[PDB]
Amino acid sequence: GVGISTGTFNNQTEFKFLENGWVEITANSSRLVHLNMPESENYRRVVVNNMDKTAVNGNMALDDIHAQIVTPWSLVDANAWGVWFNPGDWQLIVNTMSELHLVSFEQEIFNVVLKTVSETKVYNNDLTASLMVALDSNNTMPFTPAAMRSETLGFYPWKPTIPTPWRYYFQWDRTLIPSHTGTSGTPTNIYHGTDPDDVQFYTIENSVPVHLLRTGDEFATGTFFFDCKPCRLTHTWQTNRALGLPPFLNSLPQSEGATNFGDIGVQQDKRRGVTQMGNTNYITEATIMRPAEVGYSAPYYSFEASTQGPFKTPIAAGRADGNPRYAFGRQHGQKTTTTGETPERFTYIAHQDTGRYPEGDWIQNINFNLPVTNDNVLLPTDPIGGKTGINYTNIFNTYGPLTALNNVPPVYPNGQIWDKEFDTDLKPRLHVNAPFVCQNNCPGQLFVKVAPNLTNEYDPDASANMSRIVTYSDFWWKGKLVFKAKLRASHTWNPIQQMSINVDNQFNYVPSNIGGMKIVYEKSQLAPRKLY
Amino acid sequence: GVGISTGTFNNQTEFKFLENGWVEITANSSRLVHLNMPESENYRRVVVNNMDKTAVNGNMALDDIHAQIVTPWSLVDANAWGVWFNPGDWQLIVNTMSELHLVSFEQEIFNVVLKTVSETKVYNNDLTASLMVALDSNNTMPFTPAAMRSETLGFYPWKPTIPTPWRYYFQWDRTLIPSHTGTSGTPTNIYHGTDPDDVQFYTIENSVPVHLLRTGDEFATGTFFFDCKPCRLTHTWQTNRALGLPPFLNSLPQSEGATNFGDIGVQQDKRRGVTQMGNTNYITEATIMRPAEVGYSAPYYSFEASTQGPFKTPIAAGRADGNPRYAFGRQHGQKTTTTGETPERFTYIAHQDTGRYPEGDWIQNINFNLPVTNDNVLLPTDPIGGKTGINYTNIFNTYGPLTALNNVPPVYPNGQIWDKEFDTDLKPRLHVNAPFVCQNNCPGQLFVKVAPNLTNEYDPDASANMSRIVTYSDFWWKGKLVFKAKLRASHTWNPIQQMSINVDNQFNYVPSNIGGMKIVYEKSQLAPRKLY
Amino acid sequence: GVGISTGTFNNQTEFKFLENGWVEITANSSRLVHLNMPESENYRRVVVNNMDKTAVNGNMALDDIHAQIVTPWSLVDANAWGVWFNPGDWQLIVNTMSELHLVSFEQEIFNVVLKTVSETKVYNNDLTASLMVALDSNNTMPFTPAAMRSETLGFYPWKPTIPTPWRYYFQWDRTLIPSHTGTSGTPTNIYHGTDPDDVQFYTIENSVPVHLLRTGDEFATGTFFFDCKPCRLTHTWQTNRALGLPPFLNSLPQSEGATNFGDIGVQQDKRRGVTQMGNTNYITEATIMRPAEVGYSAPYYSFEASTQGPFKTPIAAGRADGNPRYAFGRQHGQKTTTTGETPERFTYIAHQDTGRYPEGDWIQNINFNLPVTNDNVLLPTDPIGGKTGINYTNIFNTYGPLTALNNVPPVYPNGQIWDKEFDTDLKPRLHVNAPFVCQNNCPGQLFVKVAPNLTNEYDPDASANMSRIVTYSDFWWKGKLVFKAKLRASHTWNPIQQMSINVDNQFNYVPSNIGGMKIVYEKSQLAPRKLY
């Protein structure tokens, strides 16, 4: 009713230790969401064209041209690690567990309170107004993860959070011929328009049922059950130079110190083994036959153009290319007492050794006369195309049927948790934005809107926008996310790397004297893992 | 007891011909293994740094820098084809069978005899000494196939074989900037050390239970059961130029001879068919649309660098790149009466036609004015980067979603049989060192050590190494490997290629007058196979 | 029999994760023990009198006078943490667990091998000689923990260890009047003898049954079951100044920085609360009434004399007094490749805040005129007895009925595990040498001896010692120690302190190039714990 609560606040993380070494992690996240009324109750088709910056030669990468439908609805996203875990629970997980599954997810919206402003300002209660809630359970509306724009719910359970205004990409065409500082003419930079065979205009009213929650009702999305593969919390260190049986050392050091080394007392052209160079007698560590390849090379800072513009070719694993950079604001980890619109940024350097170092590659003639001449070698310091700053490693792809990679690690607290799978015939082997991927069905999105509050002077035949009573809602969101983890076992004599608190990172986990909080980024895959 | 045998010698290969065309091949292999006591009963951390050879400009491929833990244990490896088959059984298999499965594997160690030397030299029996045996059934210790260093058991049932000293790769860091003969400065060549987050020190005592076998006991590893895909003993010959319906010959030869040819009596710009060149009217054999691609191109003699140095990028299929070179000694096929430390070497040229011929590739402009000019073509004789000895085929990768390949063929007798699967998220499609790959569980490794035989003057608080009685063991190893094969059927009018003995390879299978034996290499995939 | 093994080597640590958050830790420890024959097959009564060092005035603390029975038996002690755990398992325990119980213990002696030396030296096998084993299950013989002399078994599973020769304290009397550098006469320093009412001569032959193990038998002590209280792996930080409700801050900082503080905006003589100073109006943090007292003060470096000499009064908790110092050799953690008889030493600084800081104490008159004069205060800088270097805190005891303490933390790897309880009427509340204490029954001690090997010329009526054949044994010891632990839960927003590997302590867990190992000391009680 009017004076009866419809739910309970719960932001606890429960660890249930089943036997066989399996744990169930139930993460409860409760927030107070504050929502304003839409600036315009109509769907808009907007085109963004930044030719002022791209007409300058050499600024192709600064392209921001697109077309989007702007919607009077807001999205409630909880697809980020920080919504569900604090630094302590994250430490427990990444120090005690080895793998991690994703079992269940459920949401509720309760304790809705709608108010109106009258201008001093007076705030009255609209006991009869309503909040429209929609849940796209069938996944008809386009998927839109907020964690890539850093627009999820806040990371603090005691701070009210806002939802993000919903919008999606409309089709368009765009051609942008690249150039450089010093081109003669004017490269083609035109927004072509829209292809009528690709137009797709979605509406929440025509696709999903909408509930009208007043002050005393409750919305509960039933528990969605995932079916995915487990994310590993252990990293690998073995490249192709550390796979298999090492060479037998005929001379071992006698006075163990700093610069006393061992010696394989056999000439390199008189050693035993297998090699994939069928015209050479040298058996070394760079030449011996390994089972497969750990990682691959890819053209870095390469821009492929398609029917809607240029985009950076994504890289699977990093070494700075391949390392994701996160920028975010005060709701999502930045010091809540800073001033200015400059976001906080960090580059996540993963622990896994699966990337390449292009300054150490080279290609030499098949004759293999081992002291290489200049005409029989291609170095990462040789001009390709006549460009002093472009070498062959920029146009090099070594992805073949022998490549072994690892999935991306969880990024606390700004990374995604789950992700949609592409609705194509041949699916990609991994995403670079989320460790988990919903294969067939993925949790539905939760849209919220505040119902129109009309005045007594409303004319539908008026070109001007309708006149509404200034209304704003605040409700409570609750979510339950259930994981299944395995507890890790020690297989080495030596201890391993763990996450801990020390004198340097001490004040990142406690608030300041003025209530300033922050959530620094923590690494997930700490413990090593034997690859082969 | 002391005078009771604990096992039996069996080195027979049994062929059980079940109906439906399925055969069970039970290979029994018995050897007499001779083991010395460890040179040092401690684990050693050794670093090998060969900067004396790599400080010379142009010798990057001669890198042998690494770090390894040297272990007082020895490994007993039987993962090679020659341990289980002689030339006759191999002929029978590769001439009568079509596919080949891997069913079962089991090992036993029996008839242990431990002796001590007293210095003339007197050899006494230690009836109370013990031999430590460990079996890593859970696969905790790092995998180490010996067939890549040619350190498996011997290939002759009447020759005593030795086990190889066990060791494994310790983590390290290494950067080696490549150069050539004629570089100005000194390229960076430094051994950085070890990253504490990747240190992994394994011990047999802390990971596996150890049995202490005296003179009258017996160790038996239970039968391990594989679950893999069958290796095919038939090769394919069809490239992309021999797929589908040939063109109709309107003029057929009338006087069949040597140089009388047929003629497609239709102009090339007036033929019917499908082509993936949507701007040309020519339909030829180089242009017509084939279902997919058989093979791929890969950058050959390419060296990718990672956190531990440079390594050769492995190639799936060869045509000399892609063809494995095997070097080995007198236990593994070399003439047992040769003198010198020079190993015997051979390059295995496979029968399958899935590689490329870079001297016959080229890339031409999309305009396709068929008599090509110079500015509209890129040949394998054009300098890339200004290097006379490097052309575009060295930096070329044509591996896409349309590539069809074949697994690697068995290499008798020096090739591996089975292999571990990489413990990564995304697994490689094939290994280049073994036809079979254990997907989840793979047979455990068998470590042997001779227990410490202490004297009466032992002080644990002495910095010097302990004083031991010179002890050596000799035991008997038995192994059973069970395959399942299918018998092949003839589908062509013409006979096929078979392996046979002739006047040229006659004395490779019989011993000399001084007892000299040898096992030459034989090819496995002889019979053709229709690909499409 | 002669050529049949009687046991198996097992040095694995198994973690069985039962549900409800309880884990069973089964630690298996296997060693190869080397034993020589006794230097004399008789019991000796020896008196050690070091008057050469104590006759010098001021050297009372260098007293080493005592009387001991030296026994031809050796003790096999496994009461140390390093025998059962390596750094990895210790990291797992002290990072994942909260408490720790002690469930079970069992030992076995197997694979006995006895040999004789003949002098070059020849080592023959005595198939008929025997090894005497005794197990004091009824605890008749005096208890003797070896970990206080650092004489337990070795910490490395791959190094042969020796047992310690057994001996125990015989009664004696001793008076040593203390003095200083500059005393006039000669203080009384005399060894009085033995009181006939306290003589106690124990023998293994008259108290325990002895088994005679030949080459082919096995001794197994049944599983002993403890019943003790759990050791906590969490430390406390709250002293008496951090107990209860803090004072209300009427002025809170507005510009949170480094030196911006809060203010209790109430005068100290106008505050509300309870105080145990019934004649003062001041309510501060040093004066407010706390529930009880956390810790106590004790006279530090105090020497109490009794009927057998002076001894240091033991201290419960440390802050350097109260902090135990461990000295040990190459079997017990020191670098196994060092040279010299200097042992390695470390002082264990515990994490718990329960000690005192005598430089911050003082006693002032009961009148409590707050700005203290000199005649109304006693500072830690005031001479007591006229001695410039002795203040009142040296003779101060604040142990009362309001004192709350914590038990001692486990010390890896040199600390004890369990301990006997004193057989007195009123028992102490805690020991300072072991976290666990056997209340009624404690595991029996395991004595080993090599049986006399007589020659053909033996006369019992000869005053000279018997002539024996030089004999030495080596056997295998196995032990199983079962703990029950609870897995810890996170109750704070901030992470906690964990043990980890880093660039500084990296090479303490991996061996050198010459096989040099070491076990550095690790702290046990890392995570905080709310006391009140």
Q: Kindly determine whether residue A253 and residue C87, on different chains, have CB atoms separated by under 8 Å.
A: no
3-state secondary structure of B94: helix
Handedness of CA B371, B373, B375, B381 (dihedral sign): positive
Q: How far apart are CA A464 and CA B41, in angstroms?
A: 91
Handedness of CA A513, A516, A519, A520 (dihedral sign): negative
Q: Is the distance from CB of B214 to CB of B473 less than 8 angstroms?
A: no
Q: Is the distance from CB of A395 to CB of A378 less than 8 angstroms?
A: no
Q: Is the distance from CB of B132 to CB of B449 less than 8 angstroms?
A: yes
Q: How far apart are CA A37 and CA A471, in angstroms?
A: 6
Backbone angles phi, psi at B54, to 5 degrees: -90, -20
Q: Tell me how close the Cα of A258 comes to any Cα of chain C, in angstroms.
A: 9
Residues 6+ apart with CB under 8 A from C33: C76, C153, C160, C161, C162, C163, C448, C474, C475, C476, C477
Q: How far apart are CA B174 and CA B231, in angstroms?
A: 38
Q: Is the distance from CB of A29 to CB of A478 less than 8 angstroms?
A: yes
Q: How far apart are CA B403 and CA B240, in angstroms?
A: 11
Q: How far apart are CA A404 and CA A352, in angstroms?
A: 13
Sort residue B292 into left (φ over 0), alpha (ψ -120 to 50) or beta: beta
Residues 6+ apart with CB under 8 A from A272: A283, B149, B150, B151, B327, B328, B329, B343
Q: Kindly determine whether residue A366 and residue B301, on different chains, have CB atoms separated by under 8 Å.
A: yes
Sort residue A509 into left (φ over 0), alpha (ψ -120 to 50) or beta: alpha
Q: How far apart are CA C528 and CA C244, in angstroms?
A: 17
Least CA distance to A374: which residue of chain B? B180
- The structure's method of determination equals cryo-EM
Kindly state the helix (H) or strand (E) to which residue B93 belongs, with its residue range. Answer: helix B87-96
Counted across chains A and B, CB pairs separated by less than 8 A come out at 395
Cα C238 from chain centroid? 25
CA distances from B497 to B490, B520, B521 (A): 12, 19, 17
Q: Kindly determine whether residue C513 and residue A88, on different chains, have CB atoms separated by under 8 Å.
A: no
- What B116-124 contacts at long range (C-beta under 8 Å, 24+ apart), as own/partner pairs, is B116/B453, B116/B469, B116/B470, B116/B471, B116/B472, B116/C123, B117/B470, B117/B471, B117/B472, B118/B470, B118/C122
Among partner residues A13, A492, A500, which is closest to C497 by beta-carbon distance? A500
Q: How far apart are CA A402 and CA B408, in angstroms?
A: 12
The two tokens of residue C478 are 């196995």
Cα A127 from chain centroid? 41
Least CA distance to B47: which residue of chain C? C513
Cα B502 from chain centroid? 28
Q: Kindly determine whether residue C512 and residue B44, on different chains, have CB atoms separated by under 8 Å.
A: yes
Q: Kindly determine whether residue C254 and residue A496, on different chains, have CB atoms separated by under 8 Å.
A: no
Q: After which residues is chain C broken (C to N over 2.5 A)?
A: 119, 319
Q: Is the distance from CB of B221 to CB of B98 less than 8 angstroms?
A: no
Backbone angles phi, psi at C289, to 5 degrees: -85, 120
3-state secondary structure of B60: helix
The two tokens of residue B17 are 């011909």
Could you tell me which of A528, A104, C76 has the C-alpha nearest to residue B200? A528
Contact partners for chain B, using 3 or more CB pairs closer than 8 A, are A, C
Q: Is the distance from CB of A214 to CB of A129 less than 8 angstroms?
A: yes
For tokens 């660890």, name the residue: A15
Helix-then-strand count for chain A, H and E: 3, 24
Cα B254 from chain centroid? 51
How deeply is A235 buried, as exposed, middle or buried, from its count of CB atoms within 10 A (0-12, 13-18, 19+)?
buried
Handedness of CA C409, C410, C415, C417 (dihedral sign): positive
Least CA distance to B77: which residue of chain A? A245
Q: Tell me how close the Cα of B426 comes to any Cα of chain C, in angstroms.
A: 29
Backbone angles phi, psi at C223, to 5 degrees: -70, 120
> Quick check: bond before B157 cis, omega within 30?
no
End-to-end CA distance of chain B: 63
CA distances from B191 to A253, B173, B194, B417, C194 (A): 17, 6, 9, 35, 68
3-state secondary structure of C507: helix
DSSP state of A246: P
Q: CB B12: neighbour CB atoms within 10 A? A: 11
Length of chain C counted residue by residue: 532
Entry resolution in angstroms?
Answer: 2.3
Q: How far apart are CA A473 and CA B144, in angstroms?
A: 65
Could you tell me which of B140, A500, A18 has the C-alpha nearest to residue C14? B140
Q: How far apart are CA A83 and CA A34, in angstroms?
A: 16
Q: How far apart are CA B108 and CA B220, in angstroms?
A: 4
Residues forming a β-bridge with B231: B100
Q: Kindly determine whether residue A362 and residue B58, on different chains, have CB atoms separated by under 8 Å.
A: no
Residues 6+ apart with CB under 8 A from A205: none
Q: Is the distance from CB of C343 to CB of C330 less than 8 angstroms?
A: no
How deeply is B401 buried, as exposed, middle or buried, from its count of CB atoms within 10 A (0-12, 13-18, 19+)?
exposed
Q: Which residues of chain C have a CB within 8 Å of the CB of B215?
A: 2-3
Q: Give C59-75 as a 3 state SS string.
A: CHHHCCCEEEEEEEEEE
The two tokens of residue B454 are 């202490």
Beta-strand pair A344-347/A362-364: unpaired
Residues 6+ apart with CB under 8 A from B497: B526, B527, B528
Q: How far apart are CA A88 and CA A85, in angstroms?
A: 8
Least CA distance to C515: which residue of chain A? A256
Q: How far apart are CA A150 and CA A162, in angstroms?
A: 12
Q: CB B66: neighbour CB atoms within 10 A? A: 25
Could you tell me which of A19, A22, B134, A21 has the C-alpha nearest to residue C12? B134
Q: Kindly determine whether residue B149 and residue A247, on different chains, have CB atoms separated by under 8 Å.
A: yes
Q: Kindly determine whether residue B432 and residue A372, on different chains, have CB atoms separated by under 8 Å.
A: no
Among partner residues B179, B196, B201, which is closest to A497 by beta-carbon distance? B196
Q: What share of chain C is helix, strand, coil (3-state, %, to 5)?
A: 10, 30, 60
- Which amino acid is it at A201? F
Interhelix angle C87-96/A87-96, nearest 10 degrees: 150
Sort residue B385 into left (φ over 0), alpha (ψ -120 to 50) or beta: left
Residues forming a β-bridge with A325: A347
Please, what's the largest Cα pairwise distance for chain C?
98
CA distances from B386 to A48, B184, B292, B477, C160 (A): 44, 19, 35, 59, 65
Q: Kindly determine whether residue C509 and residue B201, on different chains, have CB atoms separated by under 8 Å.
A: yes
Helix-then-strand count for chain B, H and E: 3, 23
Q: Is the distance from CB of A372 to CB of B188 less than 8 angstroms?
A: no
Least CA distance to C338: which residue of chain B? B463
The two tokens of residue B496 are 């096929």
Q: Kindly determine whether residue B214 and residue C3, on different chains, have CB atoms separated by under 8 Å.
A: yes
Q: Is the distance from CB of A362 to CB of B60 less than 8 angstroms?
A: yes
Q: Tell me how close the Cα of C507 comes to any Cα of chain A, in angstroms.
A: 10
Q: How far apart are CA A280 and CA B325, in angstroms?
A: 8
Instruction: Quickly list DSSP for B157-226.
Output: TTS-B-PEEEEEEEP-EEEE----TT-SS---EEEEE--GGG-----HHHHS-EEEE-TT--EEEEEEE-
Q: Kindly determine whether residue B148 and residue A274, on different chains, have CB atoms separated by under 8 Å.
A: yes
Residues forming a β-bridge with A100: A231, A485
Between CA C87 and CA C89, with CA C88 as vertex, the angle to 5 degrees is 95
Q: How far apart are CA A6 and CA A66, in angstroms?
A: 43
Backbone angles phi, psi at A326, to 5 degrees: -110, 125
CA distances from B66 to A239, A371, B150, B190, B314 (A): 12, 21, 20, 12, 20
Q: How far apart are CA C319 and CA C352, in angstroms?
A: 9
3-state secondary structure of A25: strand
Instruction: Quickly list DSSP for A141-170.
Output: SPP--GGGTT-S--S-TTS-B-PEEEEEEE
Q: Which residues of chain B have a CB within 8 Å of the CB of A246?
A: 66, 68, 167-169
Q: CB C498: neighbour CB atoms within 10 A? A: 19
Residues forming a β-bridge with B74: B165, B448
For tokens 């919206």, name the residue: A109
3-state secondary structure of B31: strand
Q: Which domain holds residue C20?
A: 1-532
Q: Which residues of chain B have a CB within 8 Å of the CB of A490?
A: none
Q: Which residues of chain B have a CB within 8 Å of the CB of A370?
A: 58-59, 61-62
Q: Which residues of chain B have a CB within 8 Å of the CB of A497?
A: 196-197
Instruction: Quickly list DSSP for C206-259.
Output: HHS-EEEE-TT--EEEEEEE---PPEE-B-----GGG-SPPPP-SB--SS-SSS
Q: How far apart are CA A447 and CA A45, in angstroms?
A: 19
Backbone angles phi, psi at B416, to 5 degrees: -75, 165
Residues 6+ apart with CB under 8 A from A247: A264, A271, A285, B48, B64, B66, B149
How deeply is C279 buried, as exposed, middle or buried, from its count of CB atoms within 10 A (0-12, 13-18, 19+)?
exposed
The two tokens of residue A222 are 């039933």
3-state secondary structure of B318: coil
The two tokens of residue C443 are 């595991």
Residues forming a β-bridge with C479: C29, C107
The two tokens of residue C130 are 């025997």
Q: Is the distance from CB of A362 to CB of B61 less than 8 angstroms?
A: no
Could you tell me which of B459, B509, B451 has the C-alpha nearest to residue B134? B451
DSSP state of C93: H
CA distances from B375 to B363, B366, C452 (A): 11, 12, 100
Q: How far apart are CA A126 and CA A133, in angstroms?
A: 17
Least CA distance to C251: which residue of chain A? A513
DSSP state of C54: H
Q: Is the distance from CB of B311 to CB of B298 less than 8 angstroms?
A: no
Handedness of CA B369, B375, B376, B377 (dihedral sign): positive
Q: CB C267: neighbour CB atoms within 10 A? A: 10
Instruction: Quickly list DSSP for A514-530.
Output: T-------B-S--B---
How deeply is B29 buried, as exposed, middle or buried, from its count of CB atoms within 10 A (0-12, 13-18, 19+)?
buried
Q: Number of structural domains, chain C?
A: 1
Q: How far apart are CA B308 and CA A241, in angstroms?
A: 6
Length of chain A counted residue by residue: 532
Q: Is the distance from CB of C239 to CB of C294 less than 8 angstroms?
A: yes
Q: How far apart are CA A364 and CA B317, in angstroms?
A: 19
Q: How far apart are CA B65 and CA B75, in angstroms?
A: 23
The two tokens of residue A310 are 């240029």
Q: Is the distance from CB of A449 to CB of A466 less than 8 angstroms?
A: no
Q: How far apart are CA B54 and CA B309, in angstroms?
A: 12
Q: After which residues is chain A broken (C to N over 2.5 A)?
A: 119, 319
Instruction: Quickly list DSSP for A44-112.
Output: EEEEE--HHHHSSTT-GGG---EEEEEEEEEE----SGGGT--HHHHHHHHHHEEEEEEEEEEEEEEEE
Beta-strand pair B164-170/C309-312: unpaired
CA distances from B114 to B91, B107, B471 (A): 39, 20, 7
Instruction: Quickly list DSSP for C129-183.
Output: --EEEEEETT--SPP--GGGTT-S--S-TTS-B-PEEEEEEEP-EEEE----TT-
Q: Is the distance from CB of B360 to CB of B368 less than 8 angstroms?
A: no
